[PDB]
Amino acid sequence: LRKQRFMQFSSLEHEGEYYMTPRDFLFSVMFEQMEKKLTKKDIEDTLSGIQTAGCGSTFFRDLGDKGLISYTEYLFLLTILTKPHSGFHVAFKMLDTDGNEMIEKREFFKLQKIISKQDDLMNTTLQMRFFGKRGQRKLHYKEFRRFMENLQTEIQEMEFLQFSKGLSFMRKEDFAEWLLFFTNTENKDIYWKNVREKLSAGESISLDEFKSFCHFTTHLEDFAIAMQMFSLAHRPVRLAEFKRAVKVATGQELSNNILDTVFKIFDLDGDECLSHEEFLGVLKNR
Amino acid sequence: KVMEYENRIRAYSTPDKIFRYFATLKVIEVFMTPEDFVRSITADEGSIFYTLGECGLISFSDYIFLTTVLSTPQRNFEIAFKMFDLNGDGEVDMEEFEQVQSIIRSCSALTTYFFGADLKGKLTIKNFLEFQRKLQHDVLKLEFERHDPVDGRITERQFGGMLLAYSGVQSKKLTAMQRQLKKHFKEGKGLTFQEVENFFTFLKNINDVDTALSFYHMAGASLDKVTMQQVARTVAKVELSDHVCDVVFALFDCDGNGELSNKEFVSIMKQRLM
Ligand SMILES: [Ca+2]
Ligand SMILES: [Ca+2]
Ligand SMILES: [Ca+2]
Ligand SMILES: [Ca+2]
């Protein structure tokens, strides 16, 4: 039913096809539920807007409202939003079928669109960026990887800034709220009790720490298959064990502030050392 | 009835009961001769269980280690080896292994095979991966030759039997289609060992195949033979023959639409990995 979300948020109209402006894609990924016309001037707008916005991590924010996002670009971005980095490469290989280390326009454009159409019946910005103004250039691995990482970093920045009330630093209370919303387990008042009684009015959480925790959250299955050793032996996990475990199983090095906060929040037994039931049996949602 | 009993305790009972059920020799603690290990799941030179058939026998730490070596993919086994390495030098010693063995329990065979006779050796990543590879290969070879092959080829009914036995789900519809696998191939060109081993190698990497197949999952599309072969060759580095995917599509395609959906094939073989 992704087509329903898309046709709901989409804004521009051309012969029964509904295109999104980028500021609609940002809303679609940020806001869960919230609250037309297209003309050739809008077409020229989207044709021109690609040059104004840089290819950095702030691509979509600088674009603004001058853009076009087809349905397949929307589904592809959704796919590439939750890619564990180990998968990056393989995704490229699934588009590059001839194996020339490059994605031709007809290599993917025909492919994703054609499987869309086939499951149905039975010049947009991202394309203008991946294949130049005339739709003839080629894509390589380094630009694809930089774009994936920039998109993920941009969504992470927007999450952090939405939850920190526009300020440069979250407070540990606000990150606790973010974590509780994320594990969709705010119902249990025990976590609110813990954050009220142990997380004082103190240290903040900068941008990089939140970004590191996010990158850890996407690699959660590797972490589960790393800790299955302790799980099959029914062993609680101290702080140093957990820090080295994330550092090894996901490559990301978690700060001591974020781990202190998590240990303070999810400590039901009050032992200063987490266990499988209290952390992974809960984050199975993610 | 007692065979069904031991099958079910193999299915869900604890390995504490299973090892203590199939072990035969006790010490001071109980030990199992490697033959009990080939029995717990189901040797001339070159076989694995002869190089491990030398003294002594298999402890409970060695049993659990073998079962978690068989049931783990490759790129997770690399992270497991990195976990073993406490000091972070890049080469695992006997001490870290002894620590995690103690954690497991809460011997000669395994530790003298790995770290040498005097245990003074140090492991690396290549020997670990090669050990896992040889284990899985020579488990599969016995599983295969167990079916009474002829000219080194098994018929497709028995290959379907292998597939559904591995899948861990048995339903009357699926068993009926397994029986129909004989009707579908009236002549039959057999299944060699290479194709079977290749397909099971594909099945071991299924949790990554699923990640590479995310656009098809979200778009709602299904899996035909060509895309299955492409994702196999790209993710698992296997060359799925036309006949193995032929039999898989003849078996797991309940609705006969000609193509497998996510819930038909990938979900089953992924949750089997648990
Ligand atoms: Ca190409
Ligand atoms: Ca605890
Ligand atoms: Ca070491
Ligand atoms: Ca089907």
Per-residue DSSP letters for B193-228?
A: HHHHHHHHHHHHTHHHHHHHTHHHHHS---B-HHHH
- Contact flag A226-B79 (C-beta cutoff 8 Å): yes
Residue A5 touches chain B, beta carbons under 8 Å: no
Do A91 and A201 belong to one domain? no
Q: A243: number of CA atoms within 13 Å, CB side?
A: 13
Do A16 and A137 belong to one domain? yes
Kindly state whether residue A60 falls inside one of the protein's structural domains: yes
Residue B211 touches chain A, beta carbons under 8 Å: yes
Do B186 and B124 belong to one domain? no
Name the token pair of A63. 């674009």
Q: B207: number of CA atoms within 13 Å, CB side?
A: 16
Kindly state whether residue B80 falls inside one of the protein's structural domains: yes
- Contact flag A225-B214 (C-beta cutoff 8 Å): no
Q: Domain range for residue B53? A: 2-138
Q: CB under 8 Å to A182, separation ≥6 — which residues?
A: A217, A286
The secondary structure of residue A21, as a DSSP letter, is P
Is residue B123 within 8 A of residue B91, CB to CB? The reply is yes
Which residue reads 């992270």 in tokens? B79
Distance of CA B138 to CAs A252, B11, B37, B46, B134, Å? 37, 22, 13, 10, 6
Q: Is the peptide bond before B56 cis (omega within 30 degrees of 0)?
A: yes
Neighbours of ion ligand 2 (CB under 5 A): A 269, 271, 274-275
Kindly state whether residue B144 falls inside one of the protein's structural domains: no
Is residue A241 within 8 A of residue A269, CB to CB? The reply is no
Q: d(Cα A108, Cα A96) in Å, to the nearest integer?
A: 8
From chain A, the residues in CB contact with B75 under 8 A are 86
Is residue A247 within 8 A of residue A213, CB to CB? The reply is no
- Report which residue type is found at B179: R
From chain A, the residues in CB contact with B80 under 8 A are 225-226, 229
Do A205 and A276 belong to one domain? yes
- Taken in order B173, B177, B178, B182, the sign of the CA dihedral is positive
Residue B74 touches chain A, beta carbons under 8 Å: no
Kindly state whether residue A58 falls inside one of the protein's structural domains: yes
- Report which residue type is found at B142: L
Q: CB under 8 Å to A49, separation ≥6 — which residues?
A: A63, A64, A66, A67, A125
Nearest residue to B168 (alpha-carbon basis) of B203, B198, B134: B203
- Contact flag A75-B215 (C-beta cutoff 8 Å): yes
Kindly state whether residue A155 falls inside one of the protein's structural domains: no
Residue in A with minimal Cα distance to B257: A122
Which residues of A belong to the annotated binding site? 96, 98, 100, 102, 104, 107, 267, 269, 271, 273, 278
Nearest residue to A60 (alpha-carbon basis) of A132, A14, A125, A10: A125
Is residue B122 within 8 A of residue B139, CB to CB? The reply is no
- Contact flag A119-B219 (C-beta cutoff 8 Å): yes
- Contact flag A119-B221 (C-beta cutoff 8 Å): yes
Do B219 and B132 belong to one domain? no
Kindly state whether residue B253 falls inside one of the protein's structural domains: yes
Q: d(Cα A235, Cα A229) in Å, to the nearest integer?
A: 9
- Taken in order A160, A162, A166, A170, the sign of the CA dihedral is negative
Which residue reads 């029986």 in tokens? B179
From chain B, the residues in CB contact with A93 under 8 A are 234
Q: d(Cα A52, Cα A58) in Å, to the nearest integer?
A: 12
Do B131 and B12 belong to one domain? yes
Q: Is B205 annotated as a binding residue?
A: no
Distance of CA B112 to CAs A30, B44, B94, B108, B257, Å? 56, 20, 10, 5, 54
Nearest residue to B271 (alpha-carbon basis) of B211, B196, B207: B207
- Contact flag A94-B234 (C-beta cutoff 8 Å): yes
Do A267 and A197 belong to one domain? yes
From chain B, the residues in CB contact with A83 under 8 A are 211, 214
Do B209 and B268 belong to one domain? yes
Is residue A225 within 8 A of residue B72, CB to CB? The reply is yes
Q: d(Cα B213, Cα A90) in Å, to the nearest integer?
A: 10
Q: Is B127 annotated as a binding residue?
A: no
Q: How far is A137 from chain B (nearest CA, A)?
A: 24
Q: Between chain A and chain B, how many beta carbons pairs sit less than 8 Å apart?
A: 71
Do A130 and A267 belong to one domain? no
Kindly state whether residue A156 falls inside one of the protein's structural domains: no
Kindly state whether residue B143 falls inside one of the protein's structural domains: no
Residue in B with minimal Cα distance to A71: B219
Do A209 and A133 belong to one domain? no
**Alpha carbon of B90 to ligand 3 centroid (Å):** 6
Q: d(Cα A169, Cα A164) in Å, to the nearest integer?
A: 6
- Contact flag A75-B230 (C-beta cutoff 8 Å): no
Do A177 and A271 belong to one domain? yes
Point out the domain boundary residue: B78, B110, B138. B138
Is residue B202 within 8 A of residue B240, CB to CB? The reply is yes
Kindly state whether residue B145 falls inside one of the protein's structural domains: no
Cα end-to-end span (Å), chain B: 28
Is residue B170 within 8 A of residue B104, CB to CB? The reply is no
Do B125 and B11 belong to one domain? yes
Kindly state whether residue A158 falls inside one of the protein's structural domains: no
Number of C-beta neighbours around residue B4 at 10 A: 8
Residue A86 touches chain B, beta carbons under 8 Å: yes
Q: Is B264 annotated as a binding residue?
A: yes
Is residue A226 within 8 A of residue A245, CB to CB? The reply is yes
Is residue A169 within 8 A of residue A204, CB to CB? The reply is yes
Do A141 and A24 belong to one domain? yes
Which residues of A belong to the annotated binding site for Ca(2+)? 96, 98, 100, 102, 104, 107, 267, 269, 271, 273, 278
Q: d(Cα A154, Cα A81) in Å, to the nearest integer?
A: 10
Q: CB under 8 Å to A147, separation ≥6 — which residues?
A: A55, A59
Q: Domain range for residue A263? A: 166-283
Nearest residue to A125 (alpha-carbon basis) of A32, A191, A62, A205: A62
Residue A90 touches chain B, beta carbons under 8 Å: yes
Do B125 and B219 belong to one domain? no
Q: d(Cα A49, Cα A66) in Å, to the nearest integer?
A: 5
- Contact flag B83-A229 (C-beta cutoff 8 Å): yes
Is residue A206 within 8 A of residue A169, CB to CB? The reply is yes
Do B22 and B131 belong to one domain? yes
Kindly state whether residue A18 falls inside one of the protein's structural domains: yes
User: Facing residues of A20 across strands?
Assistant: A69
Do B199 and B244 belong to one domain? yes
**Alpha carbon of A92 to ligand 1 centroid (Å):** 10
Do B120 and B213 belong to one domain? no
Nearest residue to B129 (alpha-carbon basis) of B88, B86, B72: B72
Residue in A with minimal Cα distance to B81: A226
- Contact flag B79-A248 (C-beta cutoff 8 Å): yes
Name the token pair of A53. 């916005």
Do A122 and A200 belong to one domain? no
Q: Which ligand number lies closest to the CA of residue A266? A: 2
Name the token pair of B151. 């000219």
Q: CB under 8 Å to A179, separation ≥6 — which residues?
A: A261, A262, A265
Kindly state whether residue A138 falls inside one of the protein's structural domains: yes
Point out the domain boundary residue: A122, A150, A178. A150
Kindly state whether residue B218 falls inside one of the protein's structural domains: yes
Chain-centroid distance, C-alpha B71: 6
Residue A225 touches chain B, beta carbons under 8 Å: yes
The secondary structure of residue B149, as a DSSP letter, is -
Do B122 and B157 belong to one domain? no
Q: Give one word for A132, left, alpha or beta, with left for phi > 0 and alpha for psi -120 to 50.
A: left
Distance of CA A263 to CAs A104, A113, A173, A245, B194, Å? 48, 46, 14, 14, 50
- Contact flag B212-A91 (C-beta cutoff 8 Å): yes
Nearest residue to B200 (alpha-carbon basis) of B228, B231, B163: B163
Do A101 and A187 belong to one domain? no
Distance of CA A98 to CAs A103, A106, B224, B260, Å? 9, 12, 19, 24
Kindly provide the resolution of this structure in angstroms, with one decimal: 3.1
Do A53 and A122 belong to one domain? yes
- Environment class of residue A139 by beta-carbon count within 10 Å: exposed (0-12), middle (13-18) or buried (19+)? buried
Q: Would you say how long chain B is, in residues?
A: 274
Is residue A71 within 8 A of residue A6, CB to CB? The reply is yes
* Number of domains chain B contains: 2
Point out the domain boundary residue: A123, A150, A177. A150
- Contact flag A93-B234 (C-beta cutoff 8 Å): yes
Q: How far is B179 from chain A (nearest CA, A)?
A: 30
Nearest residue to A262 (alpha-carbon basis) of A159, A145, A189, A182: A182
Q: d(Cα B86, Cα B93) in Å, to the nearest integer?
A: 9
Do A22 and A85 belong to one domain? yes
- Contact flag A97-B207 (C-beta cutoff 8 Å): no
From chain B, the residues in CB contact with A74 under 8 A are none
Point out the domain boundary residue: B138, B164, B181. B138
Name the token pair of B241. 């023959």
Q: d(Cα B272, Cα B274) in Å, to the nearest integer?
A: 5
Do B86 and B208 belong to one domain? no
* Number of domains chain A contains: 2
Name the token pair of B57. 């026998």
In chain B, which ranges are continuous DSSP H helix?
2-11, 15-22, 34-39, 48-51, 60-70, 74-84, 94-105, 109-114, 125-145, 156-167, 172-184, 193-204, 206-212, 214-218, 225-231, 242-252, 267-272
Point out the domain boundary residue: B86, B104, B138. B138
Do B134 and B159 belong to one domain? no
The angle that helices B60-70 and A220-233 make with each other, rounded to 10 degrees, is 160
Residue B69 touches chain A, beta carbons under 8 Å: no
Name the token pair of B262. 């996510």
Kindly state whether residue A161 falls inside one of the protein's structural domains: no
